[PDB]
Amino acid sequence: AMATGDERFYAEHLMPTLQGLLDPESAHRLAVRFTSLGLLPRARFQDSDMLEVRVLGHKFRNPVGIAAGFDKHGEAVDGLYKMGFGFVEIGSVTPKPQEGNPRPRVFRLPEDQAVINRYGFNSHGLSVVEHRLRARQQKQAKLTEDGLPLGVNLGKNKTSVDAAEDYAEGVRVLGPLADYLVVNVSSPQGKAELRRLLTKVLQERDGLRRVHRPAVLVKIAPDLTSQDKEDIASVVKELGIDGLIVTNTTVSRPAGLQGALRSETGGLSGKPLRDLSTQTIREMYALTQGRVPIIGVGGVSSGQDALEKIRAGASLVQLYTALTFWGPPVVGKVKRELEALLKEQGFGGVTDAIGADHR
Ligand SMILES: CCn1c(CO)nn(-c2nc(O[C@@H](C)C(F)(F)F)c(C(=O)Nc3c(C)ccnc3Cl)cc2F)c1=O
Ligand SMILES: Cc1cc2nc3c(=O)[nH]c(=O)nc-3n(C[C@H](O)[C@H](O)[C@H](O)COP(=O)(O)O)c2cc1C
Numbered sequence: 547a548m549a550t551g552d553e554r555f556y557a558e559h560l561m562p563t564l565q566g567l568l569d570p571e572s573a574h575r576l577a578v579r580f581t582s583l584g585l586l587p588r589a590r591f592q593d594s595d596m597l598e599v600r601v602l603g604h605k606f607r608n609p610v611g612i613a614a615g616f617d618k619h620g621e622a623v624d625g626l627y628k629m630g631f632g633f634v635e636i637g638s639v640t641p642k643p644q645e646g647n648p649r650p651r652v653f654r655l656p657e658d659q660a661v662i663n664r665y666g667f668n669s670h671g672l673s674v675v676e677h678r679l680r681a682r683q684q685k686q687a688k689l690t691e692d693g694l695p696l697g698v699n700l701g702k703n704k705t706s707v708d709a710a711e712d713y714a715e716g717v718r719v720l721g722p723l724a725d726y727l728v729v730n731v732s733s734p735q736g737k738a739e740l741r742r743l744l745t746k747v748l749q750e751r752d753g754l755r756r757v758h759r760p761a762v763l764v765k766i767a768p769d770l771t772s773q774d775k776e777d778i779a780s781v782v783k784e785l786g787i788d789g790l791i792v793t794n795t796t797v798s799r800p801a802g803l804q805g806a807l808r809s810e811t812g813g814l815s816g817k818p819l820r821d822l823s824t825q826t827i828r829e830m831y832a833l834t835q836g837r838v839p840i841i842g843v844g845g846v847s848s849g850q851d852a853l854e855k856i857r858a859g860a861s862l863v864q865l866y867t868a869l870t871f872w873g874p875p876v877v878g879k880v881k882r883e884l885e886a887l888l889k890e891q892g893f894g895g896v897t898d899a900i901g902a903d904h905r
């Protein structure tokens with residue numbers, strides 16, 4: 547095909563060449579700019595009905611989303627839908643603008659198909675993002691109605707005494723513009739503090755007018771203890787949290803990393819994260835009895851990777867790191883491969899496969 551043509555050219559030639567000419571953060575900035583300008587192939591993969599998922603109070607035309615981190619400040623949303631993502635998550639957005647950590651803060655491990663980042667929540671801040679989303683609010687309303695929802699990942703400022711108030715500020719400012727909101731949780735009086743935090747976030751969400759009321763999801767790292775996971779599952783069910791995003795990057799360094807930069811501080815993403823992420827999905831699905839929708843993320847670069855997470859319990863998947871190695875054709879690739887595998891494994895669509903390993 548012409549589709550498999552582009553896939554090969556980008557993966558084997560263009561992306562390696564560009565990544566060899568640009569530092570990783572410059573590559574990221576340029577990518578955002580090109581995406582924001584729509585400088586991308588036309589719609590090659592027309593989405594099958596098999597790929598449609600209904601979850602979180604919304605239609606998702608396909609289950610493959612762009613993970614938080616790529617478009618931190620909501621600059622490239624429209625270009626991301628043009629790239630073929632079924633949904634877009636922006637952020638993390640912090641209340642006040644902040645610069646994040648000193649550069650260099652992004653590192654490529656090409657031998658491992660992995661990245662390490664320590665951006666440190668560099669953010670244009672809620673006000674700038676709010677006005678940016680307001681400018682395209684009705685365009686987004688039609689996109690969401692057509693099965694292309696928008697998520698917003700909310701962060702906190704580095705120097706914040708009150709994490710809960712930062713997240714609450716985010717709910718009030720960007721919740722009215724979002725189909726779902728995300729708050730990242732780290733290691734949990736720990737369970738009680740999580741309950742307190744999430745109660746405050748949900749209260750603020752419930753205070754928004756009904757038409758402008760987003761789903762709230764909790765995003766977890768893969769580095770939590772069993773007890774942490776057990777406590778998160780319990781609190782999520784108790785409070786009626788709408789969903790889980792599983793997982794963020796890992797602070798672990800799995801045996802076998804080859805990249806020269808493997809010992810850089812930060813979160814590791816891509817292929818070495820894949821199976822850690824999948825097994826975290828499997829655990830969270832079981833601990834929530836399959837009642838809490840999961841967005842599966844970490845090392846998805848193929849239809850097989852996507853389907854493994856779906857069968858483990860994910861309703862939707864996200865990727866980012868695969869895009870840094872494969873470029874934009876990876877989205878069409880993942881979707882085509884997923885459709886083919888669904889047919890091969892006897893599923894009528896994505897919905898039927900969700901949690902199939904647990905049955
Ligand atoms: C983790 C930081 N990080 C890194 C490094 O670790 N890379 N990276 C990406 N870089 C990209 O391309 C660059 C090489 C450049 F300079 F070409 F913009 C793209 C991308 O999709 N580019 C792109 C577009 C948008 C349209 C048409 N053609 C092409 Cl190649 C996607 C990425 F996630 C990125 O976010
Ligand atoms: C450069 C970079 C920046 C990221 N920034 C964020 C962020 O701001 N908020 C967040 O929740 N996750 C962030 N992530 C985590 C991704 O959303 C995703 O959970 C993780 O990278 C695993 O998926 P992947 O292996 O497909 O990249 C970031 C990841 C990378 C690589």
Ligand SMILES: O=C(O)c1cc(=O)[nH]c(=O)[nH]1
Nearest residue numbers: 664665666667668795813
């Ligand atoms: O901004 C970052 O450093 C960042 C945030 C996050 O949630 N995950 C990540 O890997 N990096």
